[PDB]
Structure 1
Amino acid sequence: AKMAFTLADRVTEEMLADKAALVVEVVEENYHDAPIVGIAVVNEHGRFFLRPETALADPQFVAWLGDETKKKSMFDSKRAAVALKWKGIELCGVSFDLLLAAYLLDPAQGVDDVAAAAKMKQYEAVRPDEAVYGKGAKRAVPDEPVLAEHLVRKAAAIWALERPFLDELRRNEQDRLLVELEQPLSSILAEMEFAGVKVDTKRLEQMGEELAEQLRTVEQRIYELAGQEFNINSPKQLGVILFEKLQLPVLKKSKTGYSTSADVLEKLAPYHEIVENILHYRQLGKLQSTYIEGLLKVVRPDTKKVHTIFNQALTQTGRLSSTEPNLQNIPIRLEEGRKIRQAFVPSESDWLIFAADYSQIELRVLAHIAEDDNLMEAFRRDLDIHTKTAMDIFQVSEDEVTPNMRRQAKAVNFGIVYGISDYGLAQNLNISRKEAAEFIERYFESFPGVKRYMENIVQEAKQKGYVTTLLHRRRYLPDITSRNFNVRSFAERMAMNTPIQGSAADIIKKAMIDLNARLKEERLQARLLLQVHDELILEAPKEEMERLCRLVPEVMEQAVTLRVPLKVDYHYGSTWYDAK
């Protein structure tokens, strides 16, 4: 049963109504400088398909797209906005984004096309994109009749689904979360992606040359120590050398076979000289393949920039993710890897990189939501939280805290921030499960409010079916009742952790919105480039650094008011590396 629509070959007035569902279709996964294959508009007047070479060369249509007062409902409006930015056209007036709506209503559904969103309200008069475009090698744009019908069906679904999504959002007290937070952030993210980050490719390449030379030396050493050649990158072949030829002890197994993970190899190093060489090889080879060759592959030779895509609709927490490239895991802990960040430079001469990061935002949120007196006091005094945690769990004074005590308290703190289990903690600290449970018990005696929060939030998840964040983001936890221990225990941890990590996410998202408004109010040229969970990275003219030193931390600090202060550290320099 085909859906009625006009396959127009000129733009008409009735296509430019002030409320419409709009589809601006970009089929390439990476939408930067990507083709727009077709356009559909559904409004009070009717349903329309337009060919993009017609529509996007039409002054009236382009004006309509750019007119804030002409309201549009879309799915994944950031994809469309960015593709249009590459063509010199602004998209404004997007007042409803179905992707973001579906994501807020239930992030566990994994909604990534109109059809998956529509199915949530029993609407099935639209096909999945995968059924129309194909997948992998077979992926293709079909002939115009099939394409046009698909785009009009997606637009009609958007038109029909706006009301029931907005109604459920409102029942959930999430309507302002959509309208005041996620949608405005989606525009800000679109600008960041489009701007991109400049890369000194010449420095990356010379780095790669040194690494290649280093890898070759260590690789030869390994063959000599093994007395043969083999694929060092294959955990199977490496397993045969280590555990069969060299008869090293098997300390841990993986579902497939013998574990060759870094932590197992650390413990084998005293038996054989090969082990340290393998570890060195794995460190260098990760830098080379993931961070030098991987970045070079996605730099546009055209501008020497990388344009990441932020997935705002993926995580259970509310966190953002970053792809092509992933700019959220650039090395920093070890000096050799950290030098990679010397390759990320300002895009204009006499500009600098500015970076501002929250200090312990997750634990500060926990203090706030648990109202734990001791944790709150510690933050109100701006104490070193790991030293203070050590003093309390070991019952020592400050000057009796040894480096090992601090490291282990830091690990407990880490476990709380990321919701890891007693098994996780034990793995992390290389201790027994029993000792790890002892650590946790000690922590709860020092922080009874945290313990009480942890009990209460698990009960609330059981009673309501879900937990919520500070700004009303929601996670459903149906596994909370399960009779499988490991399935149930995971859900309980997610009940504990999601209000911590998801509230941190909420705050930094609001800070991004507040900051973009302030930058414009202050007439600064400073621009946001990246977000990395608890940190914001900007670039600006050197003449703006002193003002940004005062402005950026203040905006981030004041994004919300909690029972404890928020605290923001900042740095700036010639490269991302130097903004430390």
Structure 2
Amino acid sequence: ALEEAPWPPPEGAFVGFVLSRKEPMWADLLALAAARGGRVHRAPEPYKALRDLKEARGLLAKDLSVLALREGLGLPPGDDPMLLAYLLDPSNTTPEGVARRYGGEWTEEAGERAALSERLFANLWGRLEGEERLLWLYREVERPLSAVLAHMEATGVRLDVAYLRALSLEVAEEIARLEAEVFRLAGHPFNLNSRDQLERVLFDELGLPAIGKTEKTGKRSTSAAVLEALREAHPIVEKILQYRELTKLKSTYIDPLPDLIHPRTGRLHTRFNQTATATGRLSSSDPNLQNIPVRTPLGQRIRRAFIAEEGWLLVALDYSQIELRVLAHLSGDENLIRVFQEGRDIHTETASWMFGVPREAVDPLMRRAAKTINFGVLYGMSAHRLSQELAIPYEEAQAFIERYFQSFPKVRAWIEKTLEEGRRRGYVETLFGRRRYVPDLEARVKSVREAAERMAFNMPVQGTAADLMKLAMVKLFPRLEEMGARMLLQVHDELVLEAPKERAEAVARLAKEVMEGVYPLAVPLEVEVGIGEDWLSAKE
């Protein structure tokens, strides 16, 4: 309110900034302002004014820092009340929402954003008083990570445009083949991408039985859940499912990628966000790396499109079975911990325990059953879905779930304990104290309660895995920077680096030891590491 001072601000001001568009690598900086002690300093020319700052403190600090890096200015992000809000409650994911909740308003003026940032930070910092685990997470994980993420987003990754052109044509050709077959079975062309038109074809013209309904529009569903069951009702059903698979891959991960190549860098600049998810896992966008298929050979073909700069090599590091390792640590189950201390193939070992047989006598189908259960228990898979993933009777599925918990009773115990903590405290927590609120545990509708139950015992595992990775990223980055290597991508429990040929194997060695020793667990952390000219070739 009282007088706006002229640029530049005193050291330690919070920034507010307006971009021409939300993606900083592609945006123009339209306006910059700083606030300290409630007084605002507005920048005459924003790009030059960036030079006057030593740190970006404020809402979306990381995003200003990426744009600053684009311009060759080293402007590290620092304090950011988004990070505080997210630690207090991970349903806090955006500035608008955080302002709506805690005070103030997210507007479109730089000066006001800078003033809001300063007030919110003080406010939220006060609300965190005495929350020592969350404060530890802020100082040791979230704040320093934000600078790592700025480096990753600003550096981007090289794409193999020639390879993607060839992949596009190969997929395009298979799609054309399938739609021709579909039209022949239907007797006319129609828009396969229109669920309304497909509904008419399947259930009115071809007279197939409808099963499920749609959620809100109240029509006959054509979802995979329905088509799955109808695969014998008509040969057209299988063709649609194949068509959908390929068209989703092409529309999402083949066609858009070259347009994301930045004209100034010649690289693709994946956006990373540390306040997006319920669990604390990093999120990515443009493209969303998390949803590149993980089973299909198609998924593998997409990773082949990510390549090293000439003379460099990609290094891919993955925390193997980290979710189950974390579950072993949280549960304290001695039989599960043993598997991982023995360094044995953990699904074979699981099968060995479950079925009461030596490991030599575990056959591949038994291993598959154990693998399915290991992750079904983790994610709270149903006996019904189990019996159809293994293709066995429903009652044999139930028996198999119980068999797992008889062998790993402390896992059963930990799940129930976690739900009890959640029902009593209103939230659950990770190893490090990252917190998720779970109000719908005490709910009437069975459907909703069970979804809440699943979040309640997943979040502690997923979030612990998440913060192990983040902590490792924070620790690795200054070591990589000094070698002239880069951190490029993070997805699931995997990290991808770029280093010159000559330093590649040294960088691999270094990254593996930092990641494996980032924190002591009841079981060791194991990192799978590979080196290659593309991402697919590096993951092995």
TM over 0.5: yes
Alignment counterpart, residue 450 of structure 1, candidates 401, 405, 411: 411
Return the offset for 1:277: 2.6
- Provide the aligned length of Structure 1 versus Structure 2: 536
Q: Percent identity?
A: 43
Match of 1:185 in 2: 145
CA contact (8 A) 1:21 1:158 kept: yes
Q: Establish whether residue 65 from structure 1 lines up as the match of residue 56 from structure 2.
A: no
Question: Which ranges of structure 1 fall in alignment gaps of 5 or more residues?
Answer: 133-146
Task: Choose 481-490 or 306-315, whichever is displaced more.
Answer: 481-490
1:77 aligns with 2:42: no
Q: SS of the residue aligned with 1:529?
A: strand
**406-415 vs 353-362, which deviates more?**
406-415
The offset of 1:226, in angstroms, is 1.8
* TM-aligned CA deviation for residue 421 of structure 1: 4.6
**Which of 264, 272, 276 is the matching residue for 2:234?**
272
Structure 2 residue aligned with 1:20: 13
What SS does the corresponding residue of 2:523 show, helix, strand or coil? coil
> In the alignment, is residue 240 of structure 1 matched against residue 221 of structure 2?
no
Shift in CA distance, 480/274, structure 1 to aligned 2, threshold 3 Å:
closer
Match of 1:504 among 465, 480, 483: 465
Provide the secondary structure at the position in 1 that maps to 2:256.
Answer: helix
What letter is aligned with 2:336? L
CA separation of 1:28 and 1:436: change in aligned 2, threshold 3 A: farther
What 5-or-longer segments of structure 2 have no aligned partner?
none
- Residue 171, structure 1, aligned to residue 153, structure 2: no
Q: Is the 2:253–2:287 Cα contact (8 Å) retained in structure 1? A: no
1:199–1:343 Cα contact (<8 Å) kept: yes
Contact 1:356/1:535 (<8 A) preserved: yes
In 1, the alpha carbon distance for the partners of 2:213 and 2:394 equals: 18
2:523 is aligned with 1:564:
yes
Q: Is residue 2:281 matched to residue 1:325? A: no
Question: Partners in 2 of 1:427 and 1:189 — Cα distance?
Answer: 41
Q: What SS does structure 2 have at the residue aligned with 1:96?
A: coil
Deviation at 1:65, TM superposition (A): 1.1
Aligned partner of 2:97 among 116, 120, 131 = 116
> Is 1:300 matched up with 2:281?
no
Displacement of 1:519: 2.1
List per-residue Cα deviations over 1:9-66 (Å, max 9, x = no partner).
Answer: xx35xx2x23222213325121213111222222248322223x2x5325xx61x413
- The answer to whether the Cα contact below 8 Å between 1:25 and 1:80 also exists between their aligned partners in 2 is no
C-alpha distance after superposition, 1:207-245 (max 9, x if no partner): 212322222222222211221111122233223333333
Deviations 1:551-575 (A, max 9, x none): 1111110011001101010111121
SS, match of residue 354 in structure 1: strand
Structure 1 residues 313 and 578, CA, compared in 2 at 3 Å: closer, same or farther? same
Contact 2:379 2:454 in 1 (8 A): no
Secondary structure of 1:28's counterpart equals: coil
Secondary structure of the corresponding residue to residue 353 of structure 1: strand
Contact 1:470 1:506 in 2 (8 A): no
Match of 1:103 in 2: 86
SS at match of 1:74: coil
- TM-score normalized by the length of structure 2: 0.92
TM superposition score normalised by structure 1: 0.86
Between the aligned partners of 1:57 and 1:482, the Cα distance in structure 2 is 55
C-alpha distance 431-311 of structure 1, shift in aligned 2 (>3 A): farther
| Structure 1 position 6 matched with structure 2 position 4 | yes
Deviation at 1:495, TM superposition (A): 1.7
2: distance between equivalents of 1:88 and 1:463? 51
SS of match in other structure, 1:570: strand
Note if contact 1:511-1:556 (Cα within 8 Å) is conserved in structure 2: yes
What residue identity is the alignment partner of 1:39? Answer: L
| Contact kept in structure 1, 2:16 and 2:112, CA below 8 Å | no
Q: CA, structure 1 residues 262+336, in 2 after alignment: closer, same or farther (shift >3 Å)?
A: same
- Are 1:213 and 2:173 an aligned pair? yes
User: Superposed, which structure 2 residues align to 1:79-478 within 5 Å?
Assistant: 79-92=63-76, 94-108=77-91, 110-113=92-95, 116-121=97-102, 123=103, 126-129=104-107, 132=108, 147=109, 151-173=110-132, 174-255=134-215, 256-262=218-224, 264-347=226-309, 349-422=310-383, 425=386, 428-429=389-390, 436-478=397-439
Deviations 1:352-399 (A, max 9, x none): 111010110010011011100000001111222222222333334334
Moved more, 296-305 or 530-539: 296-305
Structure-2 residue corresponding to 1:135? none
Aligned equivalents of 1:46 and 1:314: distance in 2?
A: 31
